[PDB]
Every structure is written in structure tokens, then in C-alpha cells.
Symmetry: none
Subunit: 45 residues, 2 copies
């Protein structure tokens, strides 16, 4: 996830290093899913 | 949307009642796809 893009992850998410995923990905807010959190999971609340 | 509680259409979308079918529809905002506007179309 582009650490310079600034607004790469959508819906108030934040690009960072997720250890559990041992990668630099989008850390979305509870509910959203997808590479940049573009999708919403209505089954997850 | 006569519904008392807000949130049927996520992401600033407006809801509407389709009498003929007793079904609810949503008027998502541009860039949003889905029955209730869940998906952002990039």
C-alpha cells in the first residue's frame, strides 16, 4: 500500500505494516474489506 | 425513507419505498454500487 499516495486506503483506513500479515497493507476500520477497503461487509458488525 | 432508523443505504445514499412491490430501494451516491450501496466502484 503506497505510503505516499495519502488517501490510497478508502473509508477512513490507514496504510501501515500489519505484522499479523507481515506486509504493508491497508488497515481498514471494522466492517470494510478489500485491498483498499472499497467494499463493505454487511455480515460483519 | 419513512424508516425511523437511519442506515439502510450506506454511504450517503437515500432510501425509497417501491409500493408496487413493498420493496425498498436506495439512491446511492456516485461511485457506490450495491443493493444498499456497500461497494465503492473505483
Amino acid at each position: 500500500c503506497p505510503l505516499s499516495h495519502d488517501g490510497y486506503c478508502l473509508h477512513d483506513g490507514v496504510c501501515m505494516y500489519i505484522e499479523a500479515l507481515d506486509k504493508y497493507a491497508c488497515n481498514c476500520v471494522v466492517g470494510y474489506i478489500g485491498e483498499r477497503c472499497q467494499y463493505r461487509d454487511l455480515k460483519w458488525w
